[PDB]
Write a protein that binds this ligand. Structure first.
Ligand SMILES: Cc1cc2nc3c(=O)[nH]c(=O)nc-3n(C[C@H](O)[C@H](O)[C@H](O)COP(=O)(O)O)c2cc1C
Ligand SMILES: Cc1cc2nc3c(=O)[nH]c(=O)nc-3n(C[C@H](O)[C@H](O)[C@H](O)COP(=O)(O)O)c2cc1C
Lengths: 189, 189
């Protein structure tokens, strides 16, 4: 099938530095926030963020992802109680599943797992950039119940669940440091 | 242990819309580019996108990733030779492994896989934002040969290989469209 010229779009050296630095600083401020307002997020913003995620690479171009957005208080609650019950197995309370205006549940269609996670990574970058917060959760083993609850095809496995909204006034984050560059990076020169 | 106040943004809605749009347009221009110049990339810029990737969330804050950056022509060729040999099994040439100034090999240290793939997603966003190109590859079959070649511990499994640089003048991309939003998104209201 057909092949077309690729658009250059060339930044000068110092522009790339400035741009890559700013993006690091923007994303370095991302934190998983477990305290989330019930304020509504504009659907446009949610659309744009999911579009952005959909621009991810995928193995053999399958785009094997489904982003399920839950705005309904009742199913959000059912989702909440389902998640809590399983986590009670030997704190266990997740309130933000209710308080967040939106739950985004990412499903993988059946190297798709990697492809879908790559997209989720892009989604999180998109949330940060848009000034929204979430906390990444991967409630596997709850997938079958949630897939059924949400009416999904069964060749879909749940991958990730992101409560999405604005941080509430009392929001805190634990005090954690990220590894320095030298503990994530090896260069062979 | 200790907890700190999370400091919010202030982006007003109209700003969030515009920002989310701009970011979608930026990332929508990302294509896997199989034709890559041998022009050196500024090392600072490479540092910044790896730093950015290291800002990813990880399960239990383990930050279980290692980004190996190969700038040495000999070992990059050795890398090319290994990769081509295996995929020859029943096009076959990946020349860009030689021509690209830099190869980035991401290892999972053993939900580590999802965590590392999330970071890789953020890495791709960062490359795009910096005006660099790549093609995502996941040669897990020859991963142990490369782990040994690259002198990494046995508890690191290879995940992804990104050749990284500027696109060639002759660089094309196949002509593909992404799914429209309504093929990736379901909203239950
Ligand atoms: C695959 C994955 C699963 C996660 N699951 C949970 C979870 O069940 N509960 C939770 O509170 N955080 C979860 N997190 C978030 C991590 O706890 C958080 O990212 C990490 O502690 C670092 O904090 P930060 O994201 O604010 O930088 C998960 C993160 C990843 C990548
Ligand atoms: C897990 C994974 C593995 C991939 N492996 C290859 C590969 O071996 N060779 C290749 O040319 N592209 C590979 N790709 C790139 C995809 O072919 C490419 O992303 C997809 O066709 C969509 O095109 P785009 O990235 O330009 O939007 C891979 C992508 C993913 C997510």
């Amino acid at each position: 099938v057909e092949h077309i010229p690729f658009s250059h779009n060339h930044y000068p050296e110092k522009e790339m530095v400035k741009r890559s630095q700013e993006f690091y600083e923007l994303l370095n401020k991302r934190r998983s926030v477990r305290f989330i307002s019930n304020e509504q997020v504009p659907m446009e913003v949610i659309d744009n963020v999911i579009r952005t995620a959909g621009t991810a690479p995928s193995g053999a171009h399958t785009e094997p992802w489904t982003f399920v957005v839950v705005k309904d208080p009742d199913v959000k609650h059912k989702i909440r109680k389902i998640i809590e019950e399983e986590e009670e197995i030997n704190n266990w309370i997740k309130e933000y599943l209710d308080t967040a205006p939106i739950l985004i549940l990412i499903f993988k269609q059946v190297y798709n797992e990697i492809s879908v996670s790559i997209a989720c990574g892009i989604l999180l970058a998109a949330l940060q950039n848009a000034g929204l917060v979430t906390v990444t959760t991967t409630p596997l083993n709850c997938g079958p119940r949630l897939r059924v609850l949400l009416g999904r095809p069964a060749h879909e496995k749940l991958l990730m669940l992101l409560p999405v909204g604005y941080p509430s006034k009392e929001a805190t984050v634990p005090d954690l440091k990220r590894k320095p560059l030298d503990q994530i990076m090896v260069t062979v020169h």
